[PDB]
Amino acid sequence: MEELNIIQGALELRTKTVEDVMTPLRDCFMITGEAILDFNTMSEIMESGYTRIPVFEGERSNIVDLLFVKDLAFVDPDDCTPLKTITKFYNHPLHFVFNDTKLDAMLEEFKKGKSHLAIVQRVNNEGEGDPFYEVLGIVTLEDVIEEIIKSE
Amino acid sequence: MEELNIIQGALELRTKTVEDVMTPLRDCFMITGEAILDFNTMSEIMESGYTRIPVFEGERSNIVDLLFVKDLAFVDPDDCTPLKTITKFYNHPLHFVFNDTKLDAMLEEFKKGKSHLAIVQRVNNEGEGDPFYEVLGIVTLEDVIEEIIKSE
Ligand SMILES: Nc1ncnc2c1ncn2[C@@H]1O[C@H](COP(=O)(O)O)[C@@H](O)[C@H]1O
Numbered sequence: 407m408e409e410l411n412i413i414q415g416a417l418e419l420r421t422k423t424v425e426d427v428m429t430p431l432r433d434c435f436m437i438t439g440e441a442i443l444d445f446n447t448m449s450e451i452m453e454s455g456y457t458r459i460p461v462f463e464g465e466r467s468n469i470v471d472l473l474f475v476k477d478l479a480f481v482d483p484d485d486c487t488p489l490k491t492i493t494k495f496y497n498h499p500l501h502f503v504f505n506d507t508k509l510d511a512m513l514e515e516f517k518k519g520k521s522h523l524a525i526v527q528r529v530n531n532e533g534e535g536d537p538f539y540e541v542l543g544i545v546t547l548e549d550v551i552e553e554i555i556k557s558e
Numbered sequence: 559m560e561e562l563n564i565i566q567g568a569l570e571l572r573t574k575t576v577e578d579v580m581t582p583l584r585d586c587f588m589i590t591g592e593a594i595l596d597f598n599t600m601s602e603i604m605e606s607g608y609t610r611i612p613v614f615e616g617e618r619s620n621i622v623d624l625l626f627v628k629d630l631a632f633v634d635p636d637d638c639t640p641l642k643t644i645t646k647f648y649n650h651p652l653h654f655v656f657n658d659t660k661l662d663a664m665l666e667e668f669k670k671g672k673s674h675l676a677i678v679q680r681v682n683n684e685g686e687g688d689p690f691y692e693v694l695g696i697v698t699l700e701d702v703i704e705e706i707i708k709s710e
Pocket residue numbers: 429433434435436455456457458459460544545546548549
């Protein structure tokens with residue numbers, strides 16, 4: 407049945423972490439904070455089909471923002487408006503989570519609040535002194551859901 | 559727990575029909591088949607935030623097509639390209655289902671295949687002779703999922 411599949415997936419929400427279902431940083435469709443929204447850029451963004459596009463500055467692992475395709479609704483290409491202005495204006499909240507976070511917990515944090523996307527990071531304790539947060543990718547509500555309803 | 563909530567929702571996937579979770583036709587964000595895609599129309603479409611927009615001709619209950627926001631990726635507003643050309647070109651498949659269809663079945667039909675949106679219709683047996691299919695709204699995978707994971 408579907409019932410049984412779903413129940414089992416829900417049973418395994420306890421063990422599994424966000425690192426197991428995440429989209430790793432290299433498979434992620436992202437965009438540079440210095441980008442200009444002109445017909446071709448908005449075109450690539452729309453073509454990607456993703457509702458949410460991480461915004462990075464410098465290295466891809468330095469993620470300062472979140473762009474939503476809806477934010478392009480009122481943008482005119484002829485204006486060649488830089489992405490910075492839109493990220494300042496809407497300023498969508500960025501959520502981070504640890505790679506060891508369990509999926510039930512992630513699901514609970516997804517329910518309360520609007521945010522369906524979280525940046526997955528881990529602690530890198532191998533220094534070079536000061537330990538730093540290392541960004542590994544993104545996880546979404548859809549990732550967790552897909553893990554629940556998938557068959558096996 | 560979340561586990562228990564999910565399991566119960568899955569238990570009730572048996573009784574519930576698509577009519578119970580659907581977005582009724584009057585709450586639906588739709589668009590006329592005669593529309594022209596120029597900056598303001600594409601703007602409304604993008605502003606709506608919906609991935610999929612039913613395309614109706616004449617009455618809102620006559621649904622000939624499905625527009626996806628991705629289909630606007632390469633469209634230039636200055637061209638004032640009519641929506642008909644894009645619906646002909648991409649021709650996304652339209653799926654229909656009966657209001658009495660149970661949610662487990664709907665979920666199964668959603669898994670196999672690409673389509674996450676179905677037009678919900680029922681048989682209107684009160685004539686006036688020939689019985690006709692009456693369109694009541696739309697149901698999506700997200701509607702069913704939301705019914706699974708919601709609390710109570
Ligand atoms: N910017 C992105 N790059 C790569 N994958 C993504 C991105 N956004 C979402 N996804 C994944 O693509 C799937 C559909 O998500 P979405 O189309 O954004 O609702 C899910 O598995 C997401 O985790």
